[PDB]
Design a protein around this ligand. Structure first.
Ligand SMILES: *[C@@H]1O[C@H](CO)[C@@H](O[C@@H]2O[C@H](CO)[C@@H](O[C@@H]3O[C@H](CO)[C@@H](O)[C@H](O)[C@@H]3O)[C@H](O)[C@H]2NC(C)=O)[C@H](O)[C@H]1NC(C)=O
Ligand SMILES: *[C@@H]1O[C@H](CO)[C@@H](O[C@@H]2O[C@H](CO)[C@@H](O[C@@H]3O[C@H](CO)[C@@H](O)[C@H](O)[C@@H]3O)[C@H](O)[C@H]2NC(C)=O)[C@H](O)[C@H]1NC(C)=O
Ligand code: NAG
Lengths: 49, 49
């Protein structure tokens, strides 16, 4: 038989953070593998794609 | 320091060396360092890049 009714109000501001993107990178095989080596470059070419 | 002939690195890549004839340290840097990108409009379109 009872009921509670608020009589006052308040304004509150909250924050929220969401990631949207990350960094972009590129990799070169001929430089990371067989750095400045013609024989190793030929071997890597023979290895496959 | 003395008793040194080669310059190592965290990635085991040579960067410095001592000349046995002039007794002075040198530096090693790969012939290719930067990145190169090429913009093309398509094979049918043209050949200028
Ligand atoms: C419930 O809501 C009522 C309004 O519907 C609030 O009453 C009034 O609230 C304001 C808030 O800024 C009070 O103003 C302040 O009053 C004194 C003046 O000396 C001082 O603290 C500040 O410079 C500011 O002006 C206002 O006095 C107040 N009125 C009464 C009659 O109290 C009430 O505060 C709300 N209740 C709660 C618990 O927040
Ligand atoms: C072989 O290695 C020896 C050390 O074992 C080096 O000896 C050095 O020889 C050079 C030759 O150019 C000398 O330099 C010269 O010194 C004076 C400076 O006033 C002058 O004659 C020339 O302008 C030149 O700079 C150097 O002093 C000498 N070192 C010594 C005596 O401690 C030599 O580099 C190597 N031999 C060659 C490259 O023929
Ligand atoms: C390039 O141009 C020719 C010209 O007739 C066209 O038929 C062909 O489909 C085009 N090629 C590509 C890959 O779009």
């Amino acid at each position: 038989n009872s009921i509670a009714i608020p009589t006052n109000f308040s304004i509150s501001v909250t924050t929220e953070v969401l990631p949207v993107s990350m960094t972009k990178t590129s990799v070169d095989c001929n430089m990371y593998i067989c750095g400045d080596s013609t024989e190793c470059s030929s071997l890597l070419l023979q290895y496959g794609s | 320091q003395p008793f040194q002939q080669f310059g190592r690195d965290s990635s085991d890549f040579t960067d410095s060396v001592k000349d046995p004839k002039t007794l002075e340290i040198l530096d090693i840097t790969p012939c290719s360092y930067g990145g190169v990108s090429v913009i093309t409009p398509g094979t049918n379109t043209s050949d200028a890049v």
